Amino acid sequence: RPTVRPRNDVAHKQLSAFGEYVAEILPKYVQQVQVSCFNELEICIHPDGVIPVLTFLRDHSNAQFKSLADLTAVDIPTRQNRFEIVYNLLSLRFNSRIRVKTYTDELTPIESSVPVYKAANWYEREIWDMFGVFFANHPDLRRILTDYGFEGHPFRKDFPLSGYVELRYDDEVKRVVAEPVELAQEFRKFDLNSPWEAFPAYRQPP
Amino acid sequence: TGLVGLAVCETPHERLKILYTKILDVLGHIPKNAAYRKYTEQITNEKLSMVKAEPDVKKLEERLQGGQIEEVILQAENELSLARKMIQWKPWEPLVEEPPASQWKW
Amino acid sequence: LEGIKDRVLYVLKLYDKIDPEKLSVNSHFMKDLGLDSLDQVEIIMAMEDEFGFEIPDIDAEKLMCPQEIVDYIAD
Amino acid sequence: TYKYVNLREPSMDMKSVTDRAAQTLLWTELIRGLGMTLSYLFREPATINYPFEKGPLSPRFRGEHALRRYPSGEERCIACKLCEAVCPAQAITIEAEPRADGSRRTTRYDIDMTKCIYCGFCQEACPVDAIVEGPNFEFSTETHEELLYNKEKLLNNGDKWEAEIAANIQADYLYR
Amino acid sequence: MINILMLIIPILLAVAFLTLVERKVLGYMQLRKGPNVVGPYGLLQPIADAIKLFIKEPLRPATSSASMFILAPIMALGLALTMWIPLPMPYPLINMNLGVLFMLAMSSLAVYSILWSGWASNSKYALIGALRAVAQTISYEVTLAIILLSVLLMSGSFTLSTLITTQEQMWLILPAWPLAMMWFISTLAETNRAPFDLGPFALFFMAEYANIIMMNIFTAILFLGTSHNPHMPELYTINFTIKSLLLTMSFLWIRASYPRFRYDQLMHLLWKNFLPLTLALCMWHVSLPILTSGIP
Amino acid sequence: NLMLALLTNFTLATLLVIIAFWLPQLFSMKFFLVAITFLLFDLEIALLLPLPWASQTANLNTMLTMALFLIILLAVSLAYEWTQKGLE
Amino acid sequence: VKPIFSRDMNEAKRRVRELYRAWYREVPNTVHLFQLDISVKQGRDKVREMFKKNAHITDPRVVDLLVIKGKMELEETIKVWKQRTHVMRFFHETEAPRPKDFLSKFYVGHD
Amino acid sequence: EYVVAKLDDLINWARRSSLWPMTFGLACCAVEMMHMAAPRYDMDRFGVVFRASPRQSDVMIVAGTLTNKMAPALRKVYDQMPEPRYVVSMGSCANGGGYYHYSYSVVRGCDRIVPVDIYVPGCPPTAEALLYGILQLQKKIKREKRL
């Protein structure tokens, strides 16, 4: 292969050492599942303790991460437990990227990452906005990307793309901008999904 | 001479030696059977030998840091806070928490 | 306390969604008068502003009758 | 890589201190900054007045949509719904019916200008090269109704730009 | 007495025809073309702005408090136009007993124009920014009085006609070298929008740009002169206009070239730094007529 | 006439307001310390105003010591403005 | 227990009571500070109809989340936030509004 | 009779001479609106002045995307404007939501908030095409108030 392959695996075995090192501590409180693919590491964490996992990787003699920078969340209705809050972490001294995930349904409150990371509070507001996941012991939980008179949570797959309150008229009332009107133009639902399985090995037995 | 960061580059030796000797005792208070104490100690003992051998050389600062003594002192300063938090909240010593539901593949 | 029952009855009878003559003295606001779980306690909040005393959440649950409310008002 | 932004004390003793003090006592560098705009005033400005002069362009530029046709009559659009699905704005709508007898080429063909973020994706996805993006700027309306394009018609009225399109596509086959 | 109308009507045209200069000369500084479509070189645009704002443009006041808001432009335009009267020129209209004292007085009363506008709006949102704009003008008037006196104490009384006669061979820029630098900066404080910036709204433009020409002329009396010539009024009239026009270019130079100094650090340039400098030169200018004979 | 010259400017200024009016038909106390110091300095300027017009007949040696004296104390008042003025 | 939320069963009910008092005091204040709009009395009637739709109470987990949301959408007035009589308005102004009947809805023909 | 018809054009010439637009930085369109200042394509002091100001301006350009958060915000700006007001919806987002459209937050059409007189269709609305929007505005002003 010359153009077909992106990069050959060489650091994959080196990154697999981290998949053993953190797992050598072996907590049922923390570890659970460790996944490593395409020069990247992924860890999912039990809901009971998220803060003790985040205090780890911060400082530490073997690996120095410090920056718990970017913070995402996954909406998926397949599992019994719905949401999956995903932390993307980066090291400056070590130069590596590791991932921290949560497995809980988190309609019930989850522990905040504000005491460990300063910029985490702004991302925590977005998760409460789009997904509707409350963070316990959080300072200033305020709406950012949502409207001031917005109902529900705008991202959830349970409701449509257009929404319920979206169209804003002016018409009859001199100053009051309208809200209750719900109709919008037709978004064409594409049913484009290819027959036959796309890739081998990814197939799971029923 | 001053470091680029906000932390002031102060000419202080053995300051790194005090903090690294302090954290070893804290680890030997509550966890003993846990692997957290068994693995962190051998890295710290390896680093302490480099300080004792090299007298105020930039090569000693270049070992596993390479951003002068000011960056290495910050690594020791938060080490005591990380060890005390690990001693207070039991996670390394005890493992008994419930397992997740069987689903992972997307 | 003297002249406390007269001050509380004048504000309670004047308020909306309440009987002026049917419910007076000893009768409960939630049991005898006929009010909702949030509606009955809301009338007690209006009486607190007129008297000039702030009422806690713990003491508000026990009080329902105007006769019982007069004893709680004294400080 | 390191480059360093800090000067680290430009003044040391006597000679180096006085000139650093002279620029703060009076001005000097402000008068030197005055000279920058002074020469900038004399040099000729690059300005284009639109109703007479025109700005620079390219052989491939996307503006207002217009569908092309074959040299011997016949509408080049074959009706696929290909360009419909690629369209990221969903501006293009297509419903097709058989044309009289034999031929099957279009009936409904509306492209919204209220939508459309201009990609050239519909130009790329088209196997017959029907929608070719012509050098267009002039489009201004009173209503949305006048702005959004109807069932071909106004798109077919792009004949006034199709002479330029035929010249531009000659720089497009075997790309540049 | 017809000459008063011959000093308002051509002056109102000068403020109008500034709109060409204020964005064409400023235009070539920024490599952009200014007025071109409207006229042959855009000469029709300055008068076109008057037809736009005066006649057709209607009013929407915030509260309109009886007398105010419709009184503030009268104070703005009135004080700006009355400043033209004491001006020496080749020959002054109704020459005052003391010249420069009338000049400093009507400029200090011109602070009211931005004061009554702050009282016109009922909201607290506008008046805080309005008082900040007063602070830009009120502070620099302290130094403006000092630098004036140092020029006067060198030669001549308060009369503006005597200031032309004292500049016979050499300009006053050379003896007052640091003081001439001050008049380039101190004049820009009076709503010029170069070191600091904050119907009837259009009338404020006609008054604020009028003061810009006024400070350009007043600097060309205190520091410029070249020649007097009482027998030939022709030679003085042309030579005075060119000197004033060169200072008008420098006023538009600061507006384009240099960013705002901040309101807090405007009080660090002045008061903290300029006031010790101006008074030290004022101390120097007291000793000058005593050290060497220099009394009018 | 000064009275005729002044009134002509104001009457034309009032007329410009009516054109736009009639024709168409369809907190923080730190600012105060700056304002007070303006007044107190200008009064020292008022005492130092006569200098170019006064010094013509009077003796120079008697004036020299007194003329500088007002400016010195005007700098001492600014010297008190250096011992913590504020954030302004 | 799991999961905590904020309160356990009976304690969650009294958190709504504390929330009710804070919002009842703001509706007279949001007439002079904000705008007249409709009425002070009619604004208080808008409060009671809002809590009637929320009145179910089966688990403290659902109740606790309503308190946090109740200290946000009703908080959009206390600390002074921009709305300009467009945001935080709950009642429909231009509503038809439709009725539920087999004679009223069927005459208009819907669904 | 003849003077009445000619004087009306003179008032219309005043707006044909100069138009002061509002500088709304609410878009990628706003960067192309900054290309109107860029010397190569200029209406600057040809008609356009970048001073803007909420009250003194005659024209307001609604640049691109508008959300439900900005829907009450842009409406109160329009009320502050003087009676001779023209609104240009420069960009495909302003015309009816170029992208997004079917999204929850983005307001469709802009005319649901503020009425539009001149529409500009272009996403990256090329400065060449942007020059039409002002030139068409000047051409559209023909006759005002007959009686």
Ligand SMILES: NC(=O)c1ccc[n+]([C@@H]2O[C@H](COP(=O)([O-])OP(=O)(O)OC[C@H]3O[C@@H](n4cnc5c(N)ncnc54)[C@H](OP(=O)(O)O)[C@@H]3O)[C@@H](O)[C@H]2O)c1
């Ligand atoms: N509150 C009340 O005053 C009151 C009380 C009781 C009943 N009403 C009823 O309600 C209605 C109120 O309407 P309104 O007075 O509000 O309307 P309006 O303001 O007078 O508006 C009518 C418009 O139609 C145009 N128009 C009408 N007749 C025209 C003609 N012959 N030629 C050209 N243009 C013409 C006018 O345009 P131009 O200006 O360009 O000509 C005007 O702009 C009345 O018809 C009245 O019967 C009112």
Ligand code: SF4
């Ligand atoms: S434009 Fe091209 S791709 Fe689209 S329907 Fe016509 S022929 Fe097919």
Ligand code: SF4
């Ligand atoms: S240019 Fe892009 S958005 Fe426009 S019609 Fe073509 S594919 Fe759709």
Ligand code: SF4
């Ligand atoms: S029309 Fe295009 S350039 Fe303009 S705001 Fe929308 S996406 Fe950005």
